[PDB]
């Protein structure tokens with residue numbers, strides 16, 4: 545049974561609600577992004593209307609085989625009428641194709657559902673500038689002040705400088721980057737660009753990247769592993785055993801691996817600055833955990849909410865424990881008292 549924080553009142557609509565069977569009263573199912581916790585339940589046998597971005601619709605058709613007649617892509621930043629209700633899709637600054645959804649209810653209420661997002665001051669100059677929001681359905685993944693991490697730009701600067709140094713010292717080093725979902729593609733694209741290489745990967749991952757509308761992608765990636773000195777591997781293989789096993793397969797081309805594991809937040813962010821980050825090393829293998837986040841930091845979240853001044857907030861993450869719920873409610877009241885809304 546579908547929980548309340550996935551239903552949009554006063555509509556026939558649900559958000560990221562595909563794992564509950566046929567939801568009573570649902571005339572259109574929205575999908576904010578192509579991450580498995582959110583699409584859980586979709587397949588080629590789904591027969592209700594799915595509303596989403598163009599890039600999410602390419603993934604639904606090619607990766608999950610949803611039939612074309614049930615896929616309804618909408619452009620971004622454009623007022624659209626769905627089943628008699630005005631909606632707008634906005635870029636979420638999460639993974640490729642990820643959106644927030646603005647719903648303009650028949651009774652005059654305006655609802656924003658953030659999906660998963662990384663808040664940014666640029667969102668203060670989207671179509672959000674123009675009107676009031678009554679209810680905010682908020683991605684609260686990192687809603688606590690202990691959750692600090694650098695800008696994506698600082699993280700990428702570290703990765704490129706680290707990879708370029710290593711390979712210039714040793715032209716026989718291979719660089720490996722872990723992946724398990726879409727998102728964070730700048731990690732492996734920026735490293736391959738500084739090294740003058742395409743990124744090599746499995747047929748299954750190449751297919752996924754081909755659905756993402758990235759400019760000049762055919763110039764940036766390949767399935768010919770022999771031609772590339774940046775390889776992608778499943779995140780589960782990014783360990784000393786997996787990396788040893790990969791280096792064996794490379795036919796004596798390489799004598800060293802430098803690997804990256806993009807994570808979200810980890811508790812080493814409480815102590816160590818990005819610039820001071822060091823790897824774990826065994827022999828000719830070194831692994832860097834880098835804190836590349838596609839969710840808001842606490843401070844980014846706080847800024848966005850204090851600017852938007854919503855009348856009510858409904859969290860969509862960390863909702864399963866009383867302690868998490870109580871913590872989040874306390875921060876929402878602080879933010880409201882501090883800003884005066």
Ligand code: NI
Pocket residue numbers: 577579638660
């Ligand atoms: Ni996500």
